[PDB]
Structures are given as C-alpha cells and as structure tokens.
Amino acid sequence: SNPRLTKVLDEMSKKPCVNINEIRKMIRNFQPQFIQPRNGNRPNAQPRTVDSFEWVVRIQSTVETQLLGATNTVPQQTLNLDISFTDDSTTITPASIPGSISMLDNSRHIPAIQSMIQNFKARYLGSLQDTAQLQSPQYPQLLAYLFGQLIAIKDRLDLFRPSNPLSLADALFGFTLAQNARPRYDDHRHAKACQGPLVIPAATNSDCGPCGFVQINANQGLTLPLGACLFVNPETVNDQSFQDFLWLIFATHHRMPNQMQNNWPFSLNIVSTCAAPGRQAPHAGELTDERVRLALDTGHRILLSMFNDDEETLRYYQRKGIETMFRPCCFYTEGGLLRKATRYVSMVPLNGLYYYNGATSYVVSPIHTDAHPGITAAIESFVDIMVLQAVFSFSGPKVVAAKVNASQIDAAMVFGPAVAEGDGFVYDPLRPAPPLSAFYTEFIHRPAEQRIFQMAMSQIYGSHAPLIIANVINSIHNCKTKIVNNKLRATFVRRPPGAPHLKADTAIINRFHDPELAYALGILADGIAPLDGSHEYNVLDELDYLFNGGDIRNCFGLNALNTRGLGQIVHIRPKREPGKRPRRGFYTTLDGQVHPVTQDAPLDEIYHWRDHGNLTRPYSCHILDSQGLEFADVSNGRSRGKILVVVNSPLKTCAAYQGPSFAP
Amino acid sequence: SNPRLTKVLDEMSKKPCVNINEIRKMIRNFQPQFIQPRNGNRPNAQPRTVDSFEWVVRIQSTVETQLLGATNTVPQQTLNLDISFTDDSTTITPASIPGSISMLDNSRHIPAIQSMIQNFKARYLGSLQDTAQLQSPQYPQLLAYLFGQLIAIKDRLDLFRPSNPLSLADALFGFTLAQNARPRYDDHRHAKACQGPLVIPAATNSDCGPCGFVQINANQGLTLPLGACLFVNPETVNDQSFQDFLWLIFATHHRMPNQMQNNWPFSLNIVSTCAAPGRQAPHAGELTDERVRLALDTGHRILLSMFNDDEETLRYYQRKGIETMFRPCCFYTEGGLLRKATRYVSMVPLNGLYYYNGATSYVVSPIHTDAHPGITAAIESFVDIMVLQAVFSFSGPKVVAAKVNASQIDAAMVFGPAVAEGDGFVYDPLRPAPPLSAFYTEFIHRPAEQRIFQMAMSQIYGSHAPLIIANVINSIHNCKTKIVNNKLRATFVRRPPGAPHLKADTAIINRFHDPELAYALGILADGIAPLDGSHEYNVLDELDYLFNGGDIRNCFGLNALNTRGLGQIVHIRPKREPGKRPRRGFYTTLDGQVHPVTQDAPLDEIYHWRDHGNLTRPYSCHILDSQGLEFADVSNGRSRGKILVVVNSPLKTCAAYQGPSFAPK
Amino acid sequence: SNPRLTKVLDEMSKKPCVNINEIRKMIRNFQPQFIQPRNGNRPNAQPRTVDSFEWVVRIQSTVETQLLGATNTVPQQTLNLDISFTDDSTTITPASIPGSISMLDNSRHIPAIQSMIQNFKARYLGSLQDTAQLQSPQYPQLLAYLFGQLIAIKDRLDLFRPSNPLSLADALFGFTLAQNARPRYDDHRHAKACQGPLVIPAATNSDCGPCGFVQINANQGLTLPLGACLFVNPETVNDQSFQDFLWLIFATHHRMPNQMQNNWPFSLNIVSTCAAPGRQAPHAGELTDERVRLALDTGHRILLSMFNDDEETLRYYQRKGIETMFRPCCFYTEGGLLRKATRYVSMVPLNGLYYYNGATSYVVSPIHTDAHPGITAAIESFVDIMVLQAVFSFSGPKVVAAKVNASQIDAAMVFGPAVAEGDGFVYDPLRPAPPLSAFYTEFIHRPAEQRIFQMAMSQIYGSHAPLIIANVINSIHNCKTKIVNNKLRATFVRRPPGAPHLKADTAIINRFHDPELAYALGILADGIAPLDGSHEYNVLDELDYLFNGGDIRNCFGLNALNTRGLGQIVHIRPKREPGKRPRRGFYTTLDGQVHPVTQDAPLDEIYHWRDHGNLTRPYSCHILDSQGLEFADVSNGRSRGKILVVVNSPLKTCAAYQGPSFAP
C-alpha cells in the first residue's frame, strides 16, 4: 500500500545492484600510496615497534568542480577515505539468533572415514553416524577465524616496516621477549594481545605438533577424543608445511587475550596411521619466508577442504577474522556508530569430525595472495556499512538531541518538517547517554526497511546473503556502545580526552561516510544526487527547496557559489503577498534558534555555512523549517548557469553509476 | 526547430565526408622535403644530441591571386604547416567517463587457457573445471602506448640525423652514459625522461627476459601472479625475437618520468610449460637494426592477438602514444591552445589474461612500417583538431576579451553583431587568468555543436567513432591550461617567456589553423568560404556585408584591392535619409574606441586595415558594429569584375573539394 | 540458400565416399620398387649410415594418351608420387581445442583392480573411484605414439639396408657409439635424435625393468605412485617378451630430443604380486629378431588392452607417431604448405590406472605386420591432405601475391574474374612473408567449407571422424610456417639455399598433389574433370572457356595438341562484331602483363605454355581475363576429334571412380 516503497523496489528490480565479485576483483591488485599517521606526518625513520595507534593507509580521492561561463577557480577538495591500521578490537560474541550460525553438513566426510576405519581393521564402537550426530556436531567456524587473524597480523607487520624486522614467525612466537614485554607487532595502550613469550605444552607420548595425536592400529581399540578429529592420510602428517601451519595457528591462538583462551579452547586431534611424529616446536629462526608461504598455502587447502569446498563462507569468516586489525574509519564528527554496531559474528566452540586425503577444488585467487589482504577485507566491510547506511537513511536523517527540558514536552518538539516526524529522539542530559542499541533495534525491524535491506543484500551477495543478514541483525541487536555527546574532530582514530561538545548536542546516527563512494562502487545509494557530470542549476528554486528541510548536499548551485557569489545574485525579503497583517518571516536552525528576517538583505548576511567546495556534510540538517520568505535575484539573468564536476576516485568499479537510487 | 541545424545536417548527408583511409593513403608514403629549426636556419652539421626543442619539419603551400584592373601585382603568401617533432608532453590521465575506456572481452582467451591449465598441473591441487574464476579485468591498453612511444623514438632519431649515430637499441638503453645525464636523444630543457643508464632488474630463479615467469608442471606449484598473464606455448617463449621485443618494451617503459612510472607499473609476466629461459640483458652491441625490426614485427603480432584482432583501437592507442613527441604546431599568434585541451587518453593499469598461439589475421600496412610514422600520427591528429575547430566556430568567433574592473559574478557581455549572445565573455586582467575549461565544456554540450560533431566523426571513422568522441570530451573536462596575454610570434614552439602582448588584449579561442587545409583534406569546414578558382565579387555589397558584422576573409573582393587602389573606388558617407533628421554615423572596432565619420571621404583613411594579400585572420572580428553608412560608388563599374586565386598544396587528398560545409553562398 | 553448396551436398549424399577400410586393405601388401634418392640415383653400394636426407620410395604411376584418327605419338608422362623417407620433423604440440583430445573412460578397469586389491587383502586408503577421478585421469595417448615411432624406426632401417646392419636393437641402444656420435639410423644435418649411447637409470630396490615396480602385500599398506599404474597378473611380469617390449619403449623415449624429455616424462609403474624381477638391461647383442618380434606383439596386445579395446584410436595415434619419419611429398613448385599445416596432434602427459589380465580381442591385421608400416601410415595422411585440398579448392585457386604497390590499392586489383573475388591476397615484399596460419584459419571457418568438410570426413571415417576433424582444425589453427617466396624445384626434399624466385611471385596455397590420385582412390575430388577414358573435345568452345579464367587442366583438346597442332587448326582474331570503334583485343596473364592482340595470328604465336602431355599443373591460373577475342578454325572440319587416356596407377582401389565431384 505504501507507494514510495513500491517505487523503490521496482527501481531496484529493474536496475540490479553490483555483484560483490567486481568489488573483489577491483581491489586484488591495489597498491597503497600513503601510510602517514592519521593526524600528523611520517617521521624520518620508522620506529622499531608498532606503538602509535594512529596510523592509517589513506586511499586518496580527489574531486574538483568548475563554474561554466565564469572566471572563478574553486580549490579542489579531497575524499579522505581512511582505513585504521594499528588498533585492536573484538568481533566475537557467543549470542546467536536462529539463522545466525549454521551447521555445515557432514555428508561427504562420515562415509570416507567409515571406509578408512573398516579398511585398517580398527575396532570401533557404534555406527559413526549417530555418534557424530550427538557426540560431536560439525562447526569448523573457529579454525577459519584464527587463519584470518594470522593473515591480518602478517599484513599489518608488512605495511609498517619497523626499521629492523625479523620474520612473520619471529615477531609472533615472541623469541627474546621480557616476561612483561608485549609482542613486537602490537605494543601500545589498550592492546588486545597476551604478552610475553608463548609457552609450548609439555611433550607427552603421542603428538602431531601442538595438538594431540591418535593412531589407528589394526585389531586394536580406537576411541576418539573430545574435540575435533581431522583424519589425514599418512603422506601428509610427515610433511613439514602441514606441521608448520599447525604451529602457526597454535601460536596465533595463544596470543589472543587471556580470557578468550578459556572460552574458545583450540582443541584439535590429528588421527592417522603413521607413527606419532612428536612435537618439534620451532625455537630459533627456522621458519623462512618461503617455508611460511608454503605453510599458509597448505593450511588454506586444508581449511577449504573442511568447509565442504565452499570458499564463500570460508572467505566470509576469514575476512571477519581480519577486521580485528584493519577497520574502515568514519568521515564525520560524531562517527564510530555504524561500524561499532555491525562487527560481531555469532560463534560456537570448534568440534566435529573431518577427512582430508587430497584437495579437490583449486581456488584461483585466495584472500591471502592479494596485494594486501587487510585492504581487501576492510573494503568488503565498508560495502556492508554503506548498504546499511543506505537503508537507514530512507525516511530522513534520524537525529538524536540532548534537551534539558526533555520530560516536559514530547518528541517532535524541535524538529520541524525536515526530520520526518517519528525519527527524532531526545533525552535529558542529567542521565547518562542512552544505548545506541535501543534506537537501532527499533530502526531495523520496521517492515519498510526490512523488505528493502533483504533485497539489497540478496542482490549483492546471492545465495550466501542470509547468513550475512542474520549476522548483522544479531550484531546490531547486540551492541554495548553509548551515544556519547563528545566529538571526534575527524583528525584522530580514538576519541581523545577533553574533546569539545558536538554541534548543538545533536548526534546524527545514520552517517558513516559520503555516499559518493557508494555511487562509485555501484551499490545502493541513499537519497542524495550523485555529483558526477554536467549539472544545470537554478538557484531560486534550488534555494527554495532547501528552506523546506531538504539537504544542502542536493543543492549544487549554492555550494558552488557559497563564497563566490550569493551576495550579489540573490536577496531575501519577507513575503508581502496578501493584504493581511505583515509578518516577520523567520526560519529555525537545528538547535531551535528561531531567526527573524525583518529587512531584506543579501543572502550571505542572513545565513552562513562553511565552504567545503561541493563536498558538504550530507545530512547536516541545516534548516529545520521556515515560513514567510521570498527570494528575488538581482543579477541580469546569470543566476541559472551550468557547472561541471569530476570525481576521479581510484576505487571506481565496472558498474560506475548503474546502481539504484531514490532521487534520480 | 532550428533551420540552420537541419540545413547543415541535410548538407552533410548530401556530401559525405572523406573517411580517414584516404588521409592515410595520401600521407603514408612521402618523405619530408626539408627539416629546420622553427626560428632560424639549420647549422652545417647536426649536433651530437637533439637539444633544441624547436626543430620542425614544414610543408610549404602557397596562394597566388591574379586579376586585371589593379595598379600593381599582388605578392604571394606562404601557408605552411609545421610539426613539432622534438618537444615532449604528457598524454595519459587517470580520469574517465562512460565511453572513455572500455574493457575487451576474454571470450576466446579463456577456453584455451583453462584447457591448458587443467592438464599440465600437479594432480594434487584439485581439478579446476570452473571457467568462472578466470575473470580478471581485460585492459591491454598500456602495452600499445609503450609500443607507440618506442616507434616515436625510432622515428625521431631517423628524422634528425645526428652527427655521430648510435644503434637505436644502444641509444635507448644508454650503456655508455654518465651518472645522471640525459639519454642520447631527448636532451634539452623541457625533456622529461628518466636519466642515467638503464638498470636491468635482478638475477632471480624464474626469469624470462625483463618480466616474471611461472611454470605449470607436476613437481611444482601454480599461483597466478597479480598483474597480467600472457599464456604462450613453449615454442615461442624459447624464440629469440620475442625475447628482444620484451626487452625493448621494458626499456622504453623505464624512461618515463619517475612519478608516472610509479603510477603505472610494468606488471607483465609470462606463464608457459617449459623451463624458464634466463634473462639475456643485452648490452654493448647485441641488438642491431634488423634484429630490432624483427622484434618490432613480432611484438606487433603479439599486440594484435591481445586486442581480439581489432586493429582499429590498437592503431588508436598506438597513435596516441606516438603523439607525445610529434604534434602539429599552431599557426596563429594567439598561442595555439586548442590542441593542448584535446590530447588526453584515459588509462588504467594493465591487467587480464592473454593467450597467444598464432596470428589469426594479417594487416597489409601496420602503422609501425610506413616511412616515418611520426608524421602520419601528427596529421592523423590534425585531421581531428580541424573538425573540432569547425564545430566550435559553427556559431561565431567566440572571443574572450579583457576589461578592467569586470564584475566577478558574471562574465557575459554582448559585443554586437557577429558574436552571438552565448559567447563573447570578458575577464579582469590583473587577476589570474581563467581556466579555459569553463568555456569549451559549455560549448560542446549544446545540441547544435554536438550532433554535428557526432555525425562528422561518424563519417570520418565509422564504427569506431564513439571511443574517439567520448575520449576527446573527457580531455576537455579536465584541462588545466589557461589563457595568457602573450604571443607565439609564428616562429616559436612555446611562448617566449618575455613580454609579448596582444594587439587588442583579446583572444579568439576557436581558431587553430587556417581552414584552407580543412577544405583541401575534404574534412568539414565552416564559416570561411573556399578560395580556389574564379569568383564574382561586388565590393559595393560585400563591404556592406562587412560592416554589419562580417569578417574580411569571406570578403575576398576587398583584400585583392586593399591597397592596390581601393581608395578611389568607393566612398563612405554618413547617410542621406530624405525626411526626419540628418544624423551622423560611426563604427566600433574590436577595441572600445568609436571614432566617427561625418562627411564623404575615400575609404582608405577611415578604416585602413593591414594587407596580408588573400589570407587574412578568419575570426579577428575587425568591426563589431556600425550604424548609418551608405558606401556610394565613385566609378562606373570598376567594382563588379572577376578574380582568380590558385592554391597548390602538397597534401591535396583524393576527394579535396567534395566535402561538406555551410559557408554563405 | 546457397545453390552450389546444396547441389554438392546432394551429390555427396547420393554417391557415398569410399570407406577408409578399402584404402587400408589395398596397401597392406604393397611391394615398393624404387628406393632411389629424390634427386640423383642410387650409388653402387649402400652407405654404412643414413646420412643423405634426400631418399624417397617412389610409387611410380604412368599415364599416356592417344589422338584417335591421327598419326601423332604423344610421349607417356609419369605421376611421380614421392614418399619422404629419411627426414625428421615434430607432430606433437600441447595445445588443444575442446574436441581435440578425449579421455578414455576407465569404466572396465577400476572394478577389476578393486576386486584384485580386495582379494589380496591389501590395505588401501579411500574408495578408488574418486581417487582415480581426481588424482589421476586416464590418458594413455603417449604410450601409443612411442610405439608408432619405434615401428617407424624399424621400417626406415629396414628399407635402407646400410651395407652391414646390426639389429633393430643394436642400432637403437647405441652400443659402441662415441659420446658425440649420432645413432646409426639417424645421422645427418638437423636430425631430431639425441646422440650418444643411452644410459640406464640406476638399479634401485624394486624394478620391473626400466620403470618402477610396486608389489601388493597381504595385510600391508599400499600407496600408488604419481604416474600411471599398470596392474598385471604375476604370470606376465616374469615373461621375457613383456620386459623386452618395456625396454624397447624406454629406449625409444630416451632418444627423442633432449627438450621433450622434460615435458613428456615416460612415467610408468608396474604393480603385481610377484617378487620384483629387477632390471636386466640388455647390454650385448641379445635381442634377436624373433625375440623382438615377440616383444612387439605382446606390446601391441597390452596397448590395445589399455585403449578399452578400440583399435581405431590406437591405430590413429600409432600412425600419427610414424609421420615423424615417413611423410607424403608435394608435386608442385611452391609445396610444403598443406602437410606442414596438418600434422600436429594435441596431447596430455601420460597418467591414470590400467588393468591387463589377458587379451580379449584378436586384431587380425595390426599395423606393425603390414608389408611396410611406413607406407601404410603415409598413405592415410595423404588421404587426409587430399580431402583437405578438395574442400579448400571449392571456390577458386586462392592465390597469394607479392606486389610492391600493395598499400596503394586494395585487393582484386590484379586478379580478374578467374580468382573468385574474395580469395586473392597481396602483401608488399618490404615486410617479411606473412604467416600461412592467418590465411588458412580464415579459409577453414567459413560455413560453406565447414559444412562440407565435416560430411566428407564423417563419410570417410565414421564414428571416429570427430577426433580427426577437431585435431586437424587445431593443427591448421596452430602453425608457424611462413609463405616464403622462394621455390623448391620439385627435385629435392628440403628447400635448397639459393633457389630462384617463384613464378610471378604468386604462391598458390591450395595445391598439394594432382587430383587424379584422389579420383583413383575414390575420395572427394575438387572441380577437375577425371582424365580416365574416351573424351570428345571441341577445341573452339573449349578454348573459349579457358579465356574466361577456367583451368587449362579441364581442357583436354588443347593439352593434347599443345605442340602437335594449334598452329594450323585454330587462329585468333579481334572481334569486329558491331559498327562501333574497333578495339585491340587483349588478355591478361597472372602477373598483370596486359597482352594486346592486334593482327590475327596462329594461336601458338600469341600464347605459349610448356607441354606436360596431359598432366598440367591443375590450378596454374594461366589467363586471368580477356576481352574482345574471336577464335576461328582453318582446318577442313578435323578440329573436333576424339582422344583416349589410360591411367594405370598401382594404387587403384575398389571404388575406382565412384567418388563424388563438382563438375561431372
């Protein structure tokens, strides 16, 4: 029955959204150019240890406009797309909704191991089907997350050359570290890595490395352990690469903080027909780069085999393991609201039965072979948040304010027609800041946003979308972040103490980054026009639409002339239309400051705003409402000019501007 | 609803423009007659290294007018075309628009590559059998651009034969160089080329000339690297010429400016099924003329196979690459800028999967073997700049003038007849000059200077039209060039950074070279009418057409007699209105002054314009306005005779005077 | 819609082409008569080593005509069908199109070996089906190619008795050869055989000869090697013939050039229940002819067993192995264009599982028992090239010329109506000669030629045609030969340095040999009449048809009288038909030499051409065009005589002249 939603769904159906594969393909070979700290500049020589948690790899992107039929030269602006580079956070949470985490079927694994046991004349108890079903289900999720974390550590330590590196393994096993010193790759305030050299478990009778080992003997009882069992052919257990991979995972799991080493035990047990090779813990430098590369390759082979040869869920989990190191930064004052609310992945302890006799599918382009896995992982997350922003900002800007007299009056007290009546919330500042979860949970579950978010995600991903939708719904439904009134200043990574209060104390909780990036990527874009090419503005009507609550970002003429004209091109005067009592026209800004307009004056003397060229804050919600105003031009018919805009971003993809929208 | 537009479209339909094949046929095979520095005379013997960035081959072409009735004979003029031939310039930009650059389709590279990677690949990495992960982007552009640059080097060395020669390979690599000295060629103030001797990269395990190498065998591993992969049979990889071609391409890629080198890395790397042939790294005198030529041939075959055997876009990118070192030189003192804003080709770092087994086609005459490709590329560019000229001028001269204390809100003042309302801007001089992309873009979007461009380019090039069109539009959008108060003096390559000054402080921004060449080549030409044969001229009316906002060039009845005795032929008097009021008349020149005329007087001392002969500035706007004039005759007849003009130029194409145009009848 | 093609298809359907079996049957017992060198004559005593790479076994065939009602005696001509005899080339290339190489199904092999392993209580890992599918597919192609090469070596060394032979094995194992000397059977410039005595691999623990050996033990682990596994019953591993055959193949594989010994490794592993017999490398003369014959027989038995008992694909590959020694020579000046472009066979490395407990099908007439396998192999190739020529010359002679002013003018510049407009190509001589592949690739893929070539091949071969069609399309699509302007002189085998330029510099790229052979064999013949029996010529109309571009080879009267009349039987005069201005009739030869005919003269004084009796070059393209000419006879009605022609070739088959054609 809703017309607007039907129109949007029809348009989305007619113009399909860009498949994820293009976005993956267009980043596999991207060479970063800037590794400066977010705030300052790179010092002469790199430090010896990753300490300043402010570094960022900057994907520069430039936009400059021109006023056709004029001699004005607007300075070029800069779409600063920042990727956090040294900062640790957690993306694991044991809390799932029904579709959040699935159970990979053990259809092709049980028969093979059954036949193996029968062939080697091992006396087992009970048909393996029911014992598999009840004793040990099949959740290999964890072992991919650790792999992603390892790749992320490698990438981080690679980009930031710490002036005398050792190896992937020498900075990971903590050789020559004081009992209180932190690992080289992660040494700064509020890190998330256990400190000191990691300690190998004691050498027991039978060991295939850092995990237990059980061999199957002809005419001999066989009993499985309690964790996960990975049957392998004897040709592999004696391989160097396999054991090196196993050791690397073990090391990565004993470095994550102490308290998650007792909730997600890294339990595994290799089973085969060899003689227990025993653990051979590498001690001195003996894991050269080529050996580590082989280890990673064999490891990915085993992982892909465990996932029923899916390579899509595996890629998703491997990525979700990486954001723990690489995150996409915000581009607004009150940021860290969307990313902080969509990061968690529901998980279950690792257990079940596996079988690997030989690889079957040859993944051409795995994650770990990309030019820089961190960037590739971060960009996919950026896409997720972009779509989420698109769905959220479907019916307004969703403001939240801190008015002291909050109880005395209800909502819609201050926000005129601009903020859709129903999306403005307030809270008195006497109490602590509310929980963002409260607002977002109510936002997501409305039918209008649900029925569109589902379609968008399905178009982007496909058969594998439902996992992502369920997981994001869970995460947003489970977030502890508060809407703190402070500001971020957009020149840091973590909120600095003593920062000033927000603008008008009104946080806006849709924005995460400019929609021009979404347009370029070819993904769903919110109701903002794409500043792409030639435009034909008309300052009068354009300006009039602004004072009805519209976003200034949709007004090209004003932004172009913000300080080069508009003091000699347009005037503002009260409306004298009827014969009734004359009234002083007034307009209300965001903070409820009713502004009167008595004597007609040049526009620049009535309203002001900073000139960011043509990249202004999208949803700034400048003018809530205005009544009784007229706009007359005082230039001899040169207020309807044309402008040109060029956006040569380096992350443009095939579907340049073919993505859907709301206001084409 | 535009009579002019429909008339021009119908005309262009009537007389189709000459497709480029005639231009190529004409220009392909003549050697230059004489090459000299633009300003001065060539020395006795050429120096060691090309070091003055003015040498330009020129192409003489003259006009002689002839008629009886004048006092003395008219001296002839020399309309000659020049080619820069030494100076360097960038041509590659990262910006893009929809049609600016397209990705080819790997519909005939995937079958073979998959069937060759499925068999010869250790039987423990699993069977691939998906033919869907092999979908990397196909952008084999930069290879052609580098190929073009290499051809340009060869041609530039050949034309300006230096005193002590060196093998093209030796000059390119530059073994016997200094620490940071310029290459043997391209050694002057504006030169932009990585100095120093070229450095071979490294001594790795898997080498196959300059680029990386990966093999696919049982006792090995396979991992396709990230850049481009050129899958070839073991037969050719062990060949000789192919290795030399790879070395040559690498060599020319490392002479680009260091920053641009970093932007677009040479990421080629080959994969095959045989042992890696170690890099050879030729030095001292390994490569020689014939071996280089053979390598060029095989390289062209490779590139053609990479392009899906298109050969029309291949030639396009090759031309654009060779254009960084050859280009037409402007002819008007204005400063020659129309070219500077049309020279950019969008690009993206090379990538994709390529398979090469055979030829699949044979092209009778590829660009790289046509007797100095530089000249043919330059003229192939000129034949497009002229079309752009024709389309812009479709309305009027489109002047841009300078006035002090101009309103910094709008810059559109009406100048009078002969200058339509849209054009004719103005700008304060004492502030930095405008950007000159704030006018062209506004020009080429209107649906009158767009459809004409569309159909003209369509007729010139045919199916492969859009690409050129799209690309040129992009060039206009982002061009940093600016209008300047200086002159080229007609004997320079760049403005002498001194104090040349404009005669009228204005600039006409839509003229690049005389339309006579456009007529001769058969391409579209506008406005100015052609002058090659007998003509009936009526001074008494042609002059009238002049003072109401014309240009002298159309008025070949005046230039003939400009100072041959036009004086005692026609008088100008204010007006003889037999009724209301005897007011006086005046005219306004391109400057502001409005000096008036009161009584009958000979014309020679009321206007008194400079006499070049029968080749005057076509868009100079000699007079803007005039009201109240009569132009009485002062001799029975003697103002209704005949005139014959002969112009012979060496580039007369096949269909020379059978092209479309819309000049006044 | 095309009428000519429909007519040809209808005629082909109505008159089936000759089955290949007749051609095979009519050569099994052919005794060659001439073994002279191509150019000169046999020396008194044969040399001691095969050095002159010019020898050829000549299949003489004679044709002589007679002029009924005349006293003239035309000398008999000679259809010199030459078979190259000592020259090495390569017919292997790792490049395949989709249908080029198939994968023989292992349907009847896996179950037998499965049952064997189960019976002998060997502990194997994993069901053998999937391991066969992924670990090792079933491509036995190579092992047949080596067999063909071995047979070819035997035949070559047999025909050319080198004055003191040793044995098949003594000239193959290189006993008593200097470390730089070449093998006796192949010692000449640009050979293709590795030199010096071949070296046996070191004697390891278990060996069944020159290849690894693995025995299956009760209650003992069994792991397969990486190459091909050939399970055999124990009764055979201890046989002498089997091991001798294995040794012979090993020797033949280590003699092919060095660089193809690292791309096609001869990997094999015998598996059985015997005790490893160990390698017993024959060292001194100990392989007598009867022992070698038994070896060859048992070897063919094993091969046929490996090929799922097909004997057709096996025969094809065995033949394709032989052309590496025996090839069919050209019969024109600019030859070595068709054969050089249709020789390659797409291949994959040898691997998979096999099983041979006992032969099942008794091939009555294998290749190696023919009178001379080389000749039989060469003739089948000759048939392939003959059909290919037939399809190519379906719409003209396909000329290629070297005109200096090639760029200035387009094609069809010189070739009048004779050369079908669309089949003439030119290239300036400044650049090197073009690649023949470019022209042939475009020729083959036209629908008109494809739809006829497919039918012809299917009729000739049958169910096994698609392999041959796909393989020839691949080969022609992959050829490195250039159209070199030089000439061959038809009295050599390899182009001699310093040979003179071609006639008019115009190579014709359809001809490989006279079509009379194709007619005799009963295979598809191009648009040339078969000179078989009584003919009723009419010199006037016949001559007129010539000057419209037709082929002189279709004009019997002219050829018969080329030098015995035509100076007193027919005159040429300009046509004075209308009242318009008289014009000098002219005709244009191949090289664009416009020839004027002003005053009527005897024919022999206006045009000339060499007299080859009645065997003239078929597609010589004598007269491109002529306009304004008349032909009047000056003999009292004896210009319409009859002629008789007799063609008693020794390779006539059952379908003497029943094959299809174009101009019956």
Residue numbers in the entry:
A (entry chain A), C (entry chain A): 37 to 700
B (entry chain B): 37 to 701
Provide the publication's sentences verbatim:
Here, we have determined the structure of TVV2 by cryo-electron microscopy (cryoEM) at 3.6 Å resolution and derived an atomic model of its capsid.
From 2,034 micrographs, 2,493 particles were boxed and used for icosahedral reconstruction of the viral capsid to 4 Å, based on the 0.143 “gold-standard” Fourier shell correlation coefficient (FSC). Within these decamers, five CSP-As are seated nearest the I5 vertex, crowding out five CSP-Bs which sit partially intercalated between the flanking CSP-As while extending between 5-fold axes to contact CSP-Bs from two other decamers forming the icosahedral 3-fold (I3) symmetry axes. The CSP-pair, A1B1, represents a reasonable initial species formed within the cytosol, as it buries the greatest surface area between subunits (∼1,540 Å2). Additionally, the interface between the possible tetrameric intermediate, A1B1-A3B3 (∼2,525 Å2), is ∼56% larger than the alternative A1B1-A2B2 tetramer (1,619 Å2) and ∼80% larger than the A1B2-A4B3 tetramer (∼1,405 Å2), suggesting that the first may be more stable and therefore more abundant in the cytosol. The protruding loop from the floor of the dimerization domain (residues 610 to 620) appears rich in positively charged residues (R612, R617, K616, R619, and R620) and inserts into a negatively charged pocket between the carapace and dimerization domains of tetramer subunits. This insertion may act as an anchor to stabilize the association of the capsid decamers through electrostatic interactions, protecting the viral genome in place of more robust interlocking strategies. The interior capsid surface appears predominantly electronegative (red) with discrete electropositive regions (blue) including the protruding loop of the dimerization domain and residues along α1 nearer the I5 vertices.
